Structure formats: structure tokens, C-alpha cells
């Protein structure tokens, strides 16, 4: 179904293609967004028809090789894609569609590379969280420290914004934590998060949702670690903040508020200055160690809970190597 | 001329003259709506304490070249000629983390409509200059503000600096009709780290852009750093940096005058006036008959020489202070007027001549009329403050009576006459002084204004300067 | 050593800056997937006078690499 760059063909032909980088089906039909010769736009495919919706910044990058990420939930869209080409060198996690636009501040991430995002429904609706995974520069600059580190971040879905004119449009509930995947027996660390896969529990308990992460290291060796939304959330609401040694503000940083209250300035400033929690998120169960590690270079993971002929249940991992193969 | 003076218990921090409503002036933690005649205090605003206007904290006024402290930061009336909708007023203070509210232009006893914190400086000694304008498809009312938001806070409890992610904010765009006068993602201009503090003097609209006169300054040290400059930004809903440029006005001084005390854009002339000064010691020892000076600049050259370089502000195409340096702009040499203690300036055009009013540290109100070559003539003294009280860096013109000008000094606001034509009796004696306001009257044999003289059509009583003394009856 | 000098040292024995390898680009002479345990070096001259440093390493497999 050709959706050609037929929306302003370039003179001096080089690379003005319309790379389709997004496919999402909505009630209106299949949403398709593309680069459109550096003019981000979307189209709707309903009944063998291709209806253009025009330019929609944030829905598609200007170039196909860009680190993109867009998430859909209800009538809200989130994106890591810049809305303008002459934009700064600061990647952001933004709510592109919703009550108001929110963007992450300059202080929360250092050259982030987004991997995946998800909505997490907790006990009360107003406590709903958005979690997303990524790699960024290591704040530790010592020569023996590894250059990048793996993270999970949390935002309150119901974040209103701040109290001051400067913080109104910013996310005021951002918190990030380092994701650790290291072997206990050996001392082997896999610091480079490659891919994440979420597997809800049969119990329906969000706290039991499993997060499977694939990690590699400088030698391109890999390991798979499993986390629980429960453990991650516990880290976010109980850990102190790196670099902050005084009693925390009453409404705690990263904690969602009840009746559409904006986050108090005194709370936002602590969070905005110290966004990293000090305690690390480790793998599930006793002995926080990987399910397994090998000398293969894994890049993607998918998990299937299944029952054997005799009713036994097994979790089967599907991993792609960088050699174009799959391991079961 | 003379004394419809208004007094205040505290020093004046700001003054703005409304068109159809009184003259507003902030003293301490209060704001007064005064009658144009400075007779009655129509309404009053108690911003901090319930009945106290007393300064909650004592501000010690440094050297006169050095900028002073104040609790008020912004006093901007706008949306005046609406016809159907009342007028509005922006009142910004150090209180509540540099908060600013939107109030009805009039009775100060009314409640504010909207308000937001971190709009202006929360530091008494910190600069703040802003201007309202309209932009966008909705043609909404915006406020472009420049301030010194970040200063070292010794007091560990009264800390009011904005968030860490806003620490480098230099100028911000505020939506006057939105949540907390909100600034969006692309609504600010950021400081270059290490550039120290920037002291913003004024903020004004010109040729589709917003200009911000300022100078690097160390508030702790109390000394100016680099060259006085001007930042240029687009009149947009988003910040679009259009350039920066230095202003050279150190003519009759060795080390120069790297301090900017006053700013005034001559409306229908596209020329900007500013009073510059060098340091007068830490006390007042280095005082010289050349320490201050009045310089005029062509807005066209200011626009042309202001490049989108990264020196005091951050840009996406370059690193701070790594590319080319800001170009210096030269003033209109003919207009320069050297002095020993100039503190304020205001300019406009009357017939077609450019009139400049200047204030001094000795309480004088000068006046210069520029020639054909825009050359500055000897300054005439229109009023003198008996107490020799330095003149507030802002000289506000009377919107109702074109013949008046509001002079503010220390704790007083006076309604001074733009010129005293009664000082001349002879027709030739008057029309030779070259004063666009004064003109001989062929009715009662005296020199006055067009309003004081029966400007009849049958008998042309009033004689202007356009003709000169070569027209008098003699 | 003065008591005041000794007490700082006794509470803070580790210096902050790390010791890195010699010369520009503080990087190793080389690295490999072999498990080396001991090293001995010989600076020597070649037939034509050129000076060479030769390292002798033992692996955990009981062999020696030159
Ligand atoms: C295929 C891939 O992306 N893996 C990289 C590869 O490019 C590189 O050669 C290797 C060397 O250790 O590091 C890893
Ligand atoms: C596609 O199907 C939907 C629902 O069946 C219908 O509302 C829509 O009109 C169809 N598209 C067109 C333009 O025929
Ligand atoms: C201002 O409003 C108050 C209360 O509404 C009123 O009492 C006062 O007289 C008003 N000011 C004047 C002088 O009109
Ligand atoms: C208000 O006045 C009282 C005395 O009437 C004085 O003690 C107080 O300092 C004033 N307000 C402030 C905090 O300056
Ligand atoms: C400031 O405005 C807010 C609305 O954004 C309002 O709730 C609050 O009461 C106001 N505060 C002041 C200074 O009266
Ligand atoms: C500002 O002056 C203070 C006091 O002299 C000094 O500590 C500081 O270094 C100055 N700021 C800079 C770096 O210019
Ligand atoms: C006003 O700005 C435009 C640039 O948009 C420029 O072309 C023009 O020369 C300016 N006017 C003056 C008097 O400089
Ligand atoms: C008014 O004065 C200005 C500057 O002195 C000059 O450029 C202009 O031509 C004059 N007006 C006319 C039309 O004489
Ligand atoms: C300066 O004045 C002279 C003589 O009065 C006049 O000829 C000249 O045009 C003026 N300069 C300009 C460019 O206005
Ligand atoms: C950290 O590693 C990632 C991926 O290997 C790379 O893209 C990034 O540039 C590195 N960080 C820096 C700034 O060197």
C-alpha cells in the first residue's frame, strides 16, 4: 500500500523518502506515521483507503535511523521524538496528547537511549504510573567506571505539572533508578540493557508483573534478568535520593497526588535536583542473579508462559542474537 | 511647574502611568494608585503585611552607579484601549518566590485574576525587566521577562531560587491568561554557565522584536564584568534568539563606562537612548566630570550588528564562548553628552525635534534638544530638587497632560512642567532658545504653549520655532 | 608525624585520583582472552641496535607467552 512521499517532492533528490516508522490501530482505523521527507505526518487506513491527517510532530522522526519511542494509552500519546528539527541536543519524554503537554526537564537524563515504555495500573487510578527503560551516560566519571548505565524511570500518569510558571509544563513526578543485572557466584556484570519484555501474572496482580531485561557487556556477552513491578515500585517509594541527605519533603518526590493537585514546589525542587534514587533495582527472588548468561550477543527477548501436556507450566524465552538467529 | 508633590514613607521602587487610570507607584510592600495631580491616594495595596508598608528587610543602597534593591519588580499596565473590557495590570514582587499577579487596572482593592510564582526575581537586589505584547493565532497577551533569578542564598530557610533545571533561565515567556502564567518548553532563553550574573535594565518592543538592555554584573563583588549589551528576541509564542551585541559608550573615559543606569527608546525615531557610567569607587571617590554619559544608538545598527552567537546565552549550533565574540555597536557620535552624574533618561519627539529629559544624582532635571545632525546642545535645567535627591532611573511622561513629566527621586513623585516659557519676555529672546514646546503668543505678548495661547485660525497668535526669530513683529 | 597530620591520614587513607597507565591514552599494552598470572620483562637490543621490551607471561594452563 504505497504511501509515497507525495506531499512535497524534493528538488535535488537525495533522501526524501516517507519511511513509515509507526503503525498503531485505533478505533478510527490503522494509524500510520512517517518521516515524509523530513515533514513528520500520519495517515489513516480504514477501508482500503489512505486518508492523510497531515503534519503531526512527535509521531515520527525526521530520519529513520533516529532513536524513537511513542506510547498510546486512552486518548493520550507519549513520545521521545523531537517536534522540530532545529531542536536542541536534549532528548525528552513528552506527553504529546492529553490535558496538557508535559516534558522532562534538562536535569533528569544525560544522553538517553530509550528502549521501551509502559503504563502500570496500580491500586488507585490516580496512582497510575508510566515506566520506561533506557540507557544513559554514567554519572560516575571515574576511569574505571563503565560509560553508560541502564535505567528504569517512573512518572505519574496523572501528573498535573508544577506550581510555578516555570514548572507548570514539566513532569513533576520523575524518578529514575539503575537496573542491575550481575551474577552472584562470579562477579560478572552486564550493564547494557538491550531490550525489555513485560509478562503480566495470571493472578492479575500488577505487583506480580514480570519485567524481562536482556543485558550485554563490553565483550558482547549476555544475560537475562527478571524484575517485578512490585520491587521496582518499592524502590521508588522507599529509597532515599542520591546526593540528598536530609529528611524528604512531606509529599514525597515521585508520589502521585489525589485530587488533581499540582506537585508542591518544595517537593519538585528536591526531585529536580536529585532524580536518581540511591538504591538499585535488582532481580526478583532470593539471590538477585540472572536467569542465565552466555557468551552469545543477544538483542531482543519475548517470553511465553505455557503448560506442558501434563499441566506443568514453563516460561520459554525467545532471544535473537546479532547473528540473525533465535535461541529458545 | 512646582509641587503637586507626593510623599511616601518608603523609597519608591517603581512607577507606571496608566492612560485613563491613576499613576501607580510602589514604595515598600505597598502599591498606590495616585490621581494624575498626585493629590489623592485613590486606592492602596498591602502586598505583604496587612497594614504595614514597612520594608520587611533593610536594603542598604550601594554606590549610585551600582543598582539598587526593591520588593516590587514589575508594574505593567496593559490592555487599556479595549472599549468594553477594562484595563489590566501586572504586579510582580520578590514575595512568594518572585510571584506576579494579573490585577484589574484600577481599584487596588479588587482581587487578582491570575498569579504565578517564579515569574520575576525573588531577590531584592536582583534585576527584572519585562514587557507585554500579543502573539500567536489566538493573539493572546504574553509577558517577556528577564531577571536575575539565581543569586547565592546564605539564609538556609528563606531560599527562593527556582528549580535546578531552571537555574540557567535568563528570559522567560509567560502566558498571561494561563495556569500560573505558564512558560512552555520553548519559552525561555538560557544563560551560559560561568558568564556570572546578568543585570537586566529594560525590556522593549521594536521592529517585530523584543530587546533587553543589560550588563554582566557581580552582585557579591558589586562590580560590572563585561560590556553593556542588548539581547534581541522574536515577538513570538516561543523564544527565538536573534542576537546579542555590545554597546560602546566609554568615549571620554579611560577604562570606559561598563554600567547601564537608564534606558529609553525614542518612539517615532528608531533610536535608543541610555545613560552609561563607569565605577565611582566603592564609595564615591573616583568621581569625575566624565564618569557618566548619554549615548544614542540607531536601532537599525543594533539589529544589524546583533549576531546569533553563543556568548552570554546558549544556542543549539554552538558551545558557550567558543565561536566569534559579540560585535560592539557605536553610538551616534554627535549625540553623546558627557556628564558627572546622570542617572535617568526619557526621550520623544515634539514637532520633529527630539527631546531628551535627563535626571541627575544631584536632583536636577535636564533637557537637551537635538539639532539637524542630532548634535547635542547645552542642557537646560528645568527643575532642581532642593534636597539634591538622586533621580529614579525611570522618567515617566504624563499621558493626560502632554506638558507634564513625572519625576521620581528617593521617596517623592513630582509633576514637573516640560518647560518654563515664562522665563522669556521678548519674542526673539524666546524663539531663539529652540524649544518645540515654547512659542511666542501674539495675544498677550508672552511666550507659552499652544494651550495657554488662543491658537485662533483667523489670527495666528502662536508662533512656532519652524520659522525662527526671523518672523517676530520686530 | 604531627597528630593532626596523622589523624587526617588515618581517617582518609585513600587518595581520590586514580593511578592510570603511562603516556597519552592511559590504555593497556594489550589484552586478550588468555588468563595470565605472572609477568617478567626484558629490555633488549636487536642485532641492529634497536631496543625492544619483551614480556613473558604464564597462563593458568602452565604455558608461557612471549
Ligand atoms: C554486532 C554488534 O552490534 N555487536 C558489537 C560488534 O559490532 C563489535 O564488533 C563487537 C566487538 O566486541 O562489540 C559488539
Ligand atoms: C469504514 O468502515 C467504518 C465502520 O464500518 C465506516 O464508518 C466508514 O465510513 C468506512 N469507510 C468508508 C469511508 O467507507
Ligand atoms: C476601592 O474599592 C473599595 C472597596 O470596593 C472602596 O471602598 C473604595 O472606595 C474604592 N476606592 C475608591 C476611592 O474609589
Ligand atoms: C511593621 O511595623 C512594626 C511596628 O509597627 C514593626 O515592628 C515591623 O518591623 C514592621 N514590619 C516589618 C516586618 O518591617
Ligand atoms: C493564585 O492563583 C491560583 C490559581 O492558579 C489561586 O488558586 C490562588 O489562590 C492564587 N493565590 C493568590 C496570590 O491569591
Ligand atoms: C563574584 O564576586 C565574588 C565576591 O568577590 C566572588 O566570590 C566570585 O568569584 C565572583 N564571581 C565570578 C566568578 O566572577
Ligand atoms: C526590521 O526587521 C527586518 C527583518 O525582518 C529588516 O529587514 C529591516 O531592515 C528592519 N528595519 C530596520 C529599520 O532595520
Ligand atoms: C525631521 O527631522 C529628521 C531628523 O532631523 C529628518 O530626517 C526629517 O527629514 C525631518 N522631517 C522633514 C520631512 O523635514
Ligand atoms: C547635518 O547637517 C548638515 C547641515 O545642517 C546637513 O547638510 C546634513 O545633511 C546633516 N546630516 C544628515 C545626514 O542629516
Ligand atoms: C555510551 O554507549 C552508547 C552505546 O554503546 C553510545 O551510544 C553513547 O554515545 C555512549 N556514551 C557516550 C557519550 O560516550
From Swiss-Prot, chain B:
Task: Give glycosylation sites per the record.
Answer: 52, 107, 115, 207, 218, 352, 373
Tissue-by-tissue expression: Detected in heart, brain, lung, spleen and placenta.
Q: Which residues form the Sema domain?
A: 1-418
Localization, per the record, is:
Membrane
- Say if the entry is tagged with keyword Transport: no
| Cysteines joined through disulfide linkages | 30-53, 122-160, 192-320, 249-295, 421-438, 427-472, 430-447, 441-453
One GO term under biological process is:
positive regulation of axonogenesis
| Record PTM | N-glycosylated.
Name any GO cellular component annotation.
cerebellar climbing fiber to Purkinje cell synapse
Keywords from UniProt, A to Z, are:
Disulfide bond, Glycoprotein, Membrane, Phosphoprotein, Receptor, Signal, Transmembrane, Transmembrane helix
Instruction: Give this protein's Gene Ontology molecular function annotations.
Output: semaphorin receptor activity; signaling receptor binding
**UniProt family annotation:** Belongs to the plexin family.
What is known about its subunit structure? Monomer. Homodimer. Interacts with SEMA7A.
Protein's job:
Receptor for SEMA7A, for smallpox semaphorin A39R, vaccinia virus semaphorin A39R and for herpesvirus Sema protein. Binding of semaphorins triggers cellular responses leading to the rearrangement of the cytoskeleton and to secretion of IL6 and IL8.
Q: What is this protein called?
A: Plexin-C1
* Residue range from the parent sequence: 35 to 507 of 1568
Curated annotation (Swiss-Prot), chain C:
Complex and partners? Interacts with ITGA1 and ITGB1. Interacts with PLXNC1.
Name-wise, this protein is: Semaphorin-7A
Tissue specificity is: Detected in skin keratinocytes and on endothelial cells from skin blood vessels (at protein level). Expressed in fibroblasts, keratinocytes, melanocytes, placenta, testis, ovary, spleen, brain, spinal cord, lung, heart, adrenal gland, lymph nodes, thymus, intestine and kidney.
Q: Which family does it belong to?
A: Belongs to the semaphorin family.
What's the disease link here?
Answer: Cholestasis, progressive familial intrahepatic, 11: An autosomal recessive form of progressive cholestasis, a disorder characterized by early onset of cholestasis that progresses to hepatic fibrosis, cirrhosis, and end-stage liver disease.
Q: What is the lineage of its organism?
A: Eukaryota, Metazoa, Chordata, Craniata, Vertebrata
What is the annotated localization of this protein?
A: Cell membrane
Which species expresses this protein natively? Homo sapiens (Human)
What fragment of the whole protein does this chain represent?
373 to 438 of 666
What does the UniProt function comment say about this protein?
Plays an important role in integrin-mediated signaling and functions both in regulating cell migration and immune responses. Promotes formation of focal adhesion complexes, activation of the protein kinase PTK2/FAK1 and subsequent phosphorylation of MAPK1 and MAPK3. Promotes production of pro-inflammatory cytokines by monocytes and macrophages. Plays an important role in modulating inflammation and T-cell-mediated immune responses. Promotes axon growth in the embryonic olfactory bulb. Promotes attachment, spreading and dendrite outgrowth in melanocytes.
Describe how expression is induced or repressed. Answer: Up-regulated in UV-irradiated fibroblasts, but not in UV-irradiated keratinocytes.
